């Protein structure tokens, strides 16, 4: 079984900003098996990056992640205040796939 | 015997046993121009397989030894849960991200190894 | 570890590619020019998922029928002349007799003739005066004295280098994974009938009937059914014509009616009465699974449109009949005869929906008899309220990829991919 | 489009049990899409219950015996649905269970791992809660 | 010393090849076939010898555009029936409201129609009685109801094996050595406008006004001229007609023009005052280099004659301009104002300069208003006395390779040879 | 030099040297396609020649030797009388009935030599 320890525990920055987002896994996956979310307070997370860097239809260009070995990063271009949330690193490595443990990025 | 694509579900390491299988079978008016226009595919979408091979040096053989060393980055399971756990379908996607560098690997690796031997026979 | 690389592995990718015929008087159908014929292996521990409404094979099979019909249509005789004004007197309201002012070899001269015409093609411009019925907007050519209309089997083999997949499940809905498959060079024999509402030769389910939709929650999408036993039927036109030869202009000659020779007795085509009760009553049974146990199936027949559509047509012996099916689709159900249907014949053509192009069938000197088979029906849902408990299936019909969607509702083409690298512990010197 | 509906908020009290279902608008079918059951604790990491996929239910390995994932496809009156019991419930088991869908049509996806999966359509949202 | 085979060395022979597109409702120029598009390496140290009028780029475009054009007005409709007589009069001398017989769907019947005619398609036969022009050397044959004339960027992409060479200089007069090429999978995008005596929507020059010409010393040769700053053109058309059909037989549709809705306001086209009279004088620096610094560069209006060669015809928003141009070319050199040029509308059209076939534009409901660039001009030089220092000038044109030839004067085809055998040390053993 | 098929009627040891001559000869609107798929028939004829010399090992060479043994059930003639008293068109009748055989006797000699020789790598 796979443990995240995401970090920041929180980031706090407003619009404008380059903002990344930090996630190491405990064994190497070596096929960029993860994923990322986001969600705003109350209502259901949102997939926007599956497989290290390919991003879902409709997700504006402005997102990208990065993979390599077991250091998982994801990065945020000229933040808009309305992308402000939580985010979450899920690998789908082995059985089961867990989750991470979540950063909010505060104003 | 199996047959074509027979061995489309088994282990890596029996599947490797049929390759002549599959390596004879990928070459062979309403109707008269369908026809003329799926032939010159067929042959030319072979021929682009057959100089990836002459590149790297493997011409007219199905297992060729070469001499990139397999990073540990690319995957890191040991033999026996290779060989004898996966099916290509199942190979072919872990490395999927890795493959457009190998073939860049393997380009350059025989193109060292062709100054090398020509170096040597001038002695 | 050392690279190794391995060249004939066994992965393939879906794609879409052009496929071509096998097939072992010209036929629309050119089998005159189709390769001949020639071989299915079983791919164990195997599962591919499936879909029959998201199929391509279909698409190619609609664009290569037309394309067929069309250039073998080309050649032959063009029949503008025939827009003029007609004097037609009754032959006894269904035939007519429609003699009229139409040209002759010699440019500067005219000729009367005259013809035998149904009331089909007819409508008239207000002995009486009339005109033929595809003259706004079409532009009839005749049919083409030595082409025939009869299916031919045709296999649609695929090129070297792509494999076709074949589900082997014998209770396939054409949706969702398919533990059996196998690899096929190329496919069983499609005979490209055209038909509406009853699908004519078919080809038999294994075990039981299945029935088979795009979105069953909608009421708008077409619901084949597939039999499991054939229900023949017997069609004839007992009445035997005689073909007269106008001459109307240098090697152009137009094929017409003469006379009738006996009494005039209408058309049609039985069934075996019992026989049709049984398998509505197979479809009943297997139609409750999807709509529910304490149902009232209430048939019903067909709502109304364009005669093409609203009436059973095909064609057999070279003559295109249109009979009404209404004592068929009868017989609300809750939880030696024949049934004898009047069909009506035409002439004058309009087959693949299209608007501005029509043909003209010369007459069958001739008694016409056909022996067919019924394997399956294109049904309909009327929308009620969502609070009965009665559904009524009126038969529909008319789109064309219907019927062949359900002979190639098993197969999928796929790409194969040969090259692969894997980690050795051999060394190239 | 695609839309997810899943029942009404619900109370009940340790040793009972509850189901919870959710009706799919948009599916296809359930041969072609695979479902997975997933829970958020009030203000916490996610969290994995089991999951239906080419019609054989799995779960988890801290909640095998305690719980039925079952679903129904479609039908001319409803769309395909799913359901939830959760058995021998306990003041644990308070949190909010989603619903959620991936596609399983092409195997070059990259959206699941051979049976591993990750999720793109979510539901929206129950909230059990137990207590006396 | 032993020989040693090298296979894929940088070797290279001049040749005569096959293009094809590649492009990213339907179109002529049929950017629904040709291959989608997807690149540029400097070659240092290689000097090659171009020449822009023994190109062969230029003789293969110009089929291609004539090829293309024919074959999107097959399919469609042939007016052969309005060769009739006519009887005409005036709308208020520019709309002729002509009237005649026409055929009806009807083989037999008559039919009385009208339509509004300009004068420039009627040529009266000795309310008058007029004929349509194309009548006695021309078939014509409708314009197409579905089919656009706008032009899109086609890249023109050799096959492999051969490559392209560009000339990456800024000041290349098409002809000596260009001591930068490149080597490019293949060209730029390329608009087919078809215009004469301007160049529209065309390719700045990177520096300064650029001369060019077969052979300066001989004044039956054009001179073609490159701008380096747009100089935009409006031409708008004020009428708001509205249109018709005409029934001419089964299946046929003859559009024609109905009423007028308004006043009849000639069409104009404003090019600025300040813009061309600024543009006009970089032209005259870069003339002076090849006439002498003394000389009177004089500019005139053109000649008179056929009645595309006189005139900037032209084809935006759907119909065919034929502007005057004589307010531009003016007064000779020495060492919120605008120009407004009159055009005459046509709609019967011969364009690539054959003979017996035609064409008729059906017309455009609405208003149609323009945006262009002027970037180029075709001049022409009077025959003088060789004695004198005055040079007059008169825009030509006509002729279409020197549109084209104004795009592809840098490239250049070749044909790789890659085998190659060499001298050295080693041996087989 | 007696050119293409020059040497048709010789004895097969003397109308073996001169392979060269045939191996060099055998790839190179009403006239519009009449042309068009006599070219195209020309290199399929040929590259599905060149796939059976890569699958027996016999890749780029003309005269080429294998391990399988001549079995004496399908020619029993010594070397005397096959290279000194035939021509290739008298000894092509003879074994046409056991040529589908040998043409899998070959092309599965050479698929347990790809292996073997990979075995003797790893050591
Ligand atoms: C196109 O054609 C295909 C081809 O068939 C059609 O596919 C068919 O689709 C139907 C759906 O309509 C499928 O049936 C459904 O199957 C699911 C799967 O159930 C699995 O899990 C069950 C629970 O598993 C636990 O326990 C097992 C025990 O070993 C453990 O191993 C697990 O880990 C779990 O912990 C399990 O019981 C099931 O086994 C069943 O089947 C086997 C063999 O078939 C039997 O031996 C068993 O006795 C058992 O019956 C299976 O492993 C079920 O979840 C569905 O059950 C619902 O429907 C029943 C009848 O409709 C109903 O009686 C049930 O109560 C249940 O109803 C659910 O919903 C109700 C309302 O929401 C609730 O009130 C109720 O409580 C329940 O929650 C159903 O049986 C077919 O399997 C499938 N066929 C194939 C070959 O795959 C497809 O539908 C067609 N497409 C279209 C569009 O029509
Ligand atoms: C096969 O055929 C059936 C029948 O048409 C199709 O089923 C329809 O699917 C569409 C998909 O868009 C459904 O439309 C959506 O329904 C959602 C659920 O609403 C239902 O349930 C709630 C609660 O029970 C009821 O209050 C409501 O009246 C409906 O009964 C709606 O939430 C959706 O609205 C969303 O979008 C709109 C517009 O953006 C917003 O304004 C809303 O706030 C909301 O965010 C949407 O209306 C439709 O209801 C289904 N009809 C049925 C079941 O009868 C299948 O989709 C089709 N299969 C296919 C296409 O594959
Ligand atoms: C060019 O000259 C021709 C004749 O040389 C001329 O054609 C004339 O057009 C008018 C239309 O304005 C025709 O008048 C019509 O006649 C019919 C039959 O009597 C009427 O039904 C028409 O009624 C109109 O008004 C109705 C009330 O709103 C409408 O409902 C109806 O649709 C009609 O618009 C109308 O009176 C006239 O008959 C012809 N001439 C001949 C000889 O037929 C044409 O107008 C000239 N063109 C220009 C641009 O001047
Ligand atoms: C470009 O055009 C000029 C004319 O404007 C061409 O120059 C002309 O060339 C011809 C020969 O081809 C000259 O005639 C020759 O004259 C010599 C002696 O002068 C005589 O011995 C020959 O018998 C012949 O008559 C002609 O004079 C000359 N024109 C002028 C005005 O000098 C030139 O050839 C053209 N360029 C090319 C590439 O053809
Ligand atoms: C890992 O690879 C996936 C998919 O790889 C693609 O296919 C391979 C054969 C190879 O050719 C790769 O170069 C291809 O990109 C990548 O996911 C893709 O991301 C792009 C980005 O927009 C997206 O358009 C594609 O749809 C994605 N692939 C699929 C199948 O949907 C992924 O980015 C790679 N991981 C990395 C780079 O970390
Ligand atoms: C020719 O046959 C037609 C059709 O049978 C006759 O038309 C009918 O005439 C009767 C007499 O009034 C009407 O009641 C019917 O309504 C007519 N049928 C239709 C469809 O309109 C016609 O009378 C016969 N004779 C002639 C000279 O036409
Ligand atoms: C349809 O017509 C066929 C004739 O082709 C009928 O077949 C005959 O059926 C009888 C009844 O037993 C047999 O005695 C005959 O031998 C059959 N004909 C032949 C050629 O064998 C059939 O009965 C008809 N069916 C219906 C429903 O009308
Ligand atoms: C097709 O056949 C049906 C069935 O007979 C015809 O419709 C019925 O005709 C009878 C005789 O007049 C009427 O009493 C019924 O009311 C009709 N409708 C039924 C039974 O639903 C029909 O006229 C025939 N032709 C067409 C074009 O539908
Ligand atoms: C209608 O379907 C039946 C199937 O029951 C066909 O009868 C069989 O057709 C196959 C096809 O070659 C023959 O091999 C069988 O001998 C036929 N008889 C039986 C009892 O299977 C019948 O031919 C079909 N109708 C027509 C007109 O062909
Ligand atoms: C199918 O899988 C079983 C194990 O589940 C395996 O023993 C068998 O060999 C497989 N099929 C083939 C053809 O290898
Ligand atoms: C292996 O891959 C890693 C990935 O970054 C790379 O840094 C390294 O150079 C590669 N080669 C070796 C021998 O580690
Ligand atoms: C190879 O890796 C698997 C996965 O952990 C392990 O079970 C196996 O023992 C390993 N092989 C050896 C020789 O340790
Ligand atoms: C044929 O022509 C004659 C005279 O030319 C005419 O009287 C007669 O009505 C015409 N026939 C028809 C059917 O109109
Ligand atoms: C053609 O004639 C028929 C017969 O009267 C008529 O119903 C139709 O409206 C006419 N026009 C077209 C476009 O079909
Ligand atoms: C169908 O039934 C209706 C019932 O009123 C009847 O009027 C009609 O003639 C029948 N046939 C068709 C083709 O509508
Ligand atoms: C259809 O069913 C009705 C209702 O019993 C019956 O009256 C009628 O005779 C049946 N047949 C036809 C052809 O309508
Ligand atoms: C019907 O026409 C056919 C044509 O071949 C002929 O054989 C047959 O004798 C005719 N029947 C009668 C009763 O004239
Ligand atoms: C029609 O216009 C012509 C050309 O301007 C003119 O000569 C003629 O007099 C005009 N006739 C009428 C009736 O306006
Ligand atoms: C139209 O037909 C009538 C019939 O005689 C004729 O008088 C008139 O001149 C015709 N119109 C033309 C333009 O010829
Ligand atoms: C041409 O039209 C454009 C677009 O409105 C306008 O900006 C420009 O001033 C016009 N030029 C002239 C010379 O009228
Ligand atoms: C050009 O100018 C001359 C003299 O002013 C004049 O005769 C002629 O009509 C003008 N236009 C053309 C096109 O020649
Ligand atoms: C001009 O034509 C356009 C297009 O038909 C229309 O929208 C506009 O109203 C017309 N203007 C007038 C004044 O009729
Ligand atoms: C004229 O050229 C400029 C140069 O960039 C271009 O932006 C402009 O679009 C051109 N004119 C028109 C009407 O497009
Ligand atoms: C033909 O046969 C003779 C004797 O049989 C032999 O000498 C000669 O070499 C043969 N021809 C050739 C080309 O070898
Ligand atoms: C030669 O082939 C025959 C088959 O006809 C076989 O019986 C025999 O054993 C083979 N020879 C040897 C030595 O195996
Ligand atoms: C081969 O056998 C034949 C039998 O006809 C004999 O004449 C000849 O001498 C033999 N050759 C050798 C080399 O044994």
């Given at each position: 079984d796979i443990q995240m320890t995401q970090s920041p525990s929180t980031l706090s920055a407003s619009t404008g900003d380059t903002v990344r987002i930090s996630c190491r896994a405990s064994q190497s996956i070596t096929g960029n098996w993860v994923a990322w979310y986001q969600q705003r307070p109350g209502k259901a997370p949102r997939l926007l990056i599956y497989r290290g860097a390919a991003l879902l239809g409709?997700?504006?260009?402005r997102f990208r992640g990065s993979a390599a070995g077991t250091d998982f990063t994801l990065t945020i271009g000229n933040l808009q205040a309305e992308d402000f949330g939580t985010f979450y690193c899920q690998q789908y490595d082995t059985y089961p796939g867990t989750f991470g443990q979540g950063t909010k990025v505060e104003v | 015997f199996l047959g074509f694509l027979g061995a489309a579900g088994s282990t890596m390491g029996a599947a490797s046993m049929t390759l002549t299988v599959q390596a004879r079978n990928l070459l062979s008016t309403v109707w008269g121009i369908k026809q003329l226009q799926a032939r010159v595919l067929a042959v030319e979408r072979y021929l682009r397989d057959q100089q990836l091979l002459g590149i790297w040096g493997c011409s007219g053989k199905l297992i060729c030894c070469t001499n990139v060393p397999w990073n540990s980055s690319w995957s890191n399971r040991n033999l026996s849960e290779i060989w004898d756990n996966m099916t290509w379908l199942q190979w072919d996607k872990e490395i999927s991200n890795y493959t457009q560098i190998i073939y860049g690997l393997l380009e350059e690796s025989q193109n060292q190894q062709e100054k090398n031997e020509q170096d040597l026979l001038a002695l | 570890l050392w690279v190794t690389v391995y060249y004939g592995v066994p992965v393939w990718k879906d794609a879409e590619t052009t496929l071509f015929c096998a097939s072992d008087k010209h036929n629309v159908w050119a089998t005159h020019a189709c390769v001949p014929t020639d071989q299915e292996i079983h791919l164990e521990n195997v599962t591919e998922e499936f879909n029959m409404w998201k199929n391509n094979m279909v698409e190619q099979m609609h664009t290569d029928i037309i394309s067929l019909w069309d250039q073998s249509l080309k050649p032959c005789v063009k029949l503008?002349?025939?827009?003029v004004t007609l004097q037609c007197t009754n032959?006894?309201?269904?035939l007519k007799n429609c003699s009229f002012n139409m040209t002759t070899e010699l440019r500067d001269k005219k000729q009367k003739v005259y013809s035998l015409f149904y009331r089909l093609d007819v409508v008239q411009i207000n002995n009486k005066e009339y005109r033929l019925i595809n003259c706004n907007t079409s532009a009839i050519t005749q049919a083409c004295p030595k082409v025939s209309f009869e299916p031919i089997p045709i296999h649609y083999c695929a090129p070297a280098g792509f494999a076709i997949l074949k589900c082997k499940?014998?209770?396939?809905?054409?949706?969702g994974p398919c533990p059996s498959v196998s690899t096929v060079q190329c496919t069983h024999g499609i005979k490209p009938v055209v038909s509406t509402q009853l699908l004519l030769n078919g080809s038999l389910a294994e075990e039981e009937v299945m029935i088979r939709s795009e979105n069953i929650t909608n009421n708008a999408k077409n619901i084949l059914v597939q039999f499991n036993t054939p229900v023949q039927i017997n069609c004839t036109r007992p009445n035997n014509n005689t073909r007269k030869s106008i001459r109307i202009g240098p090697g152009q000659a137009f094929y017409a009616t003469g006379d009738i020779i006996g009494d005039i007795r209408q058309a049609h085509c039985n069934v075996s009465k019992a026989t049709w009760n049984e398998t509505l009553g197979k479809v009943v049974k297997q139609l409750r699974k999807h709509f529910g146990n304490n149902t009232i199936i209430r048939f019903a027949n067909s709502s109304g449109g364009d005669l093409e559509v609203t009436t059973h047509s095909f064609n057999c012996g070279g003559e295109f009949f249109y009979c009404n099916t209404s004592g068929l689709f009868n017989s609300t159900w809750i939880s030696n005869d024949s049934i004898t249907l009047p069909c009506r014949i035409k002439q004058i053509i309009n087959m693949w929906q299209r608007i501005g192009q029509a043909m003209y069938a010369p007459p069958i000197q001739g008694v016409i008899r056909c022996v067919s088979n019924i394997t399956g029906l294109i049904l309909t849902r009327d929308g009620g309220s969502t609070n009965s408990t009665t559904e009524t299936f009126r038969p529909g019909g008319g789109d064309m990829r219907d019927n062949w969607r359900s002979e190639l509702y098993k197969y999928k083409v796929v790409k194969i991919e040969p090259l692969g690298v894997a980690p050795t512990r051999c060394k190239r010197r | 489009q695609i839309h997810l509906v899943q029942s009404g908020t619900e109370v009940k009290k340790p040793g009972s049990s509850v189901t919870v279902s959710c009706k799919a608008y948009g599916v296809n079918t359930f041969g072609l899409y695979a479902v997975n059951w997933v829970r958020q604790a009030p203000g916490q990491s996610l969290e994995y219950i089991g999951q239906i996929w080419r019609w054989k239910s799995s779960a988890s390995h801290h909640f095998r015996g305690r719980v039925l994932i079952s679903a129904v496809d479609l039908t001319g009156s409803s769309p395909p649905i799913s359901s939830l019991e959760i058995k021998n419930l306990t003041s644990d088991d308070t949190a909010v269970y989603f619903c959620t869908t991936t596609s399983t049509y092409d195997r070059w996806s990259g959206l699941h791992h051979d049976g591993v999966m990750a999720f793109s359509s979510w539901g929206q949202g129950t909230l059990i809660s137990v207590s006396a």
């Open positions: 409709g997700v504006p260009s | - | 503008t002349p025939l827009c032959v006894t309201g269904e499940d014998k209770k396939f809905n054409g949706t | -």
